[PDB]
Amino acid sequence: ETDYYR
Amino acid sequence: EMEKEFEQIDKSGSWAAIYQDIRHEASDFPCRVAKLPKNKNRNRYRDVSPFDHSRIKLHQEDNDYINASLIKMEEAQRSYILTQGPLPNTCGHFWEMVWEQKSRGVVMLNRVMEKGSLKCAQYWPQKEEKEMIFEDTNLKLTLISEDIKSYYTVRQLELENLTTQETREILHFHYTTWPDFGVPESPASFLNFLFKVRESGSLSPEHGPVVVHASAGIGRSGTFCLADTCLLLMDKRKDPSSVDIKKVLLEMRKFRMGLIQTADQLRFSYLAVIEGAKFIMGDSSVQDQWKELSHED
């Protein structure tokens, strides 16, 4: 995924 | 005081509320260079970007961008470079940064593959006979040796500038059992690792700032740096109890966004500092206890 902040 | 505060929050069960207050109070600075179209493939995550004022600039005229920030802790007199796990196209930039910033140590708190997903590129050589050449930056990296322990690995690497023929020894501290958005096994296992990094000389002001990373380089990295900074402060203040962990974390968040990603990582930072304080107070025997409880052998 390109997101970390969930 | 931190220990009485820890017990008060633990009894109330308000760790989620305390951490949410830190997030609300956290600094918000521009990340204009990071959000530039040409730098899209240089960012691992769209929501993790360095601030323009504290970003590390590469010494190349083409594009000076790397998703990395300099955390300058003024009172503690220590600096750290927090960066993301390099991408297949930024492994040369990562090592260019290590060279230019004159870093002697690299702290890796994640694994290349976590739960079947690529979180970081294989930026260092696994076999000594198989060195890595980064043609883009004209750098050569060779594995000299490795000391594998149960939960962590220390590697001795040789970084060479192929243009000047200059050689440098880089120490690689890899924590292999710290899961994403998780905490270490015990304060003892974390502190045994932190002190191994300290005793190596990698954190000395004679060298450049230590490079600390995870996948995004904010969650696990923030936990490591907060614990280290809080321990440094209670050594030179002559009043150990004056250290406010929440204030130190907010000071750190002025340099890079989202340092410490969960309420449990904040709670662990408290536990790590409270346990670590015993060594800073003059009791040398507690470092030997951490070695036993860590189960490194």
Side-chain angles (χ1 to χ4, degrees), chain B residues 13-60 62-114 116-196:
Chain B
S14 53
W15 282 106
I18 290 289
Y19 175 60
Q20 230 64 71
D21 282 324
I22 294 172
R23 286 193 67 233
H24 181 262
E25 289 177 83
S27 297
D28 190 27
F29 293 119
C31 298
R32 212 204 88 250
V33 183
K35 287 296 173 182
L36 241 42
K38 63 169 185 181
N39 291 324
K40 198 183 179 185
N41 53 35
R42 290 182 184 221
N43 293 311
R44 181 171 285 279
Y45 302 112
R46 285 168 55 230
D47 51 1
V48 180
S49 299
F51 295 144
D52 292 318
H53 82 88
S54 56
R55 72 175 188 97
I56 297 292
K57 301 184 186 182
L58 301 166
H59 301 5
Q60 53 171 119
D62 196 78
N63 187 349
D64 69 1
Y65 186 76
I66 182 163
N67 191 316
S69 314
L70 179 64
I71 322 298
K72 258 178 174 174
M73 300 309 283
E74 196 175 14
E75 203 199 337
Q77 289 171 18
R78 191 104 98 196
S79 286
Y80 316 90
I81 288 168
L82 308 206
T83 191
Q84 63 176 205
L87 289 160
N89 62 309
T90 63
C91 290
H93 302 141
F94 179 85
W95 290 111
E96 191 197 333
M97 176 176 70
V98 173
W99 187 268
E100 295 164 356
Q101 303 302 310
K102 292 163 177 290
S103 306
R104 206 248 175 149
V106 177
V107 179
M108 178 169 184
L109 305 167
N110 70 122
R111 281 184 290 180
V112 170
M113 197 174 268
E114 292 171 342
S117 185
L118 290 165
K119 300 294 182 180
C120 184
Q122 187 54 241
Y123 67 91
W124 74 97
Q126 295 167 286
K127 290 177 183 180
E128 31 269 279
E129 335 84 72
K130 293 278 192 179
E131 358 67 77
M132 293 177 88
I133 298 161
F134 303 97
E135 290 181 69
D136 65 315
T137 51
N138 212 214
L139 288 164
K140 189 188 187 180
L141 186 70
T142 311
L143 175 67
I144 303 305
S145 62
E146 57 178 21
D147 186 42
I148 309 169
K149 292 294 178 185
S150 70
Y151 71 99
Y152 76 98
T153 298
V154 181
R155 300 178 185 96
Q156 193 184 320
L157 303 169
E158 188 189 283
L159 185 58
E160 193 202 321
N161 187 328
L162 297 170
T163 317
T164 67
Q165 292 165 100
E166 194 199 317
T167 279
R168 284 182 202 170
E169 182 182 285
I170 307 298
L171 300 182
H172 191 252
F173 303 94
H174 193 183
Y175 203 116
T176 60
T177 51
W178 199 336
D180 65 316
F181 301 95
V183 294
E185 311 92 286
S186 65
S189 66
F190 171 75
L191 291 161
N192 180 244
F193 179 82
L194 175 60
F195 283 80
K196 185 74 179 182

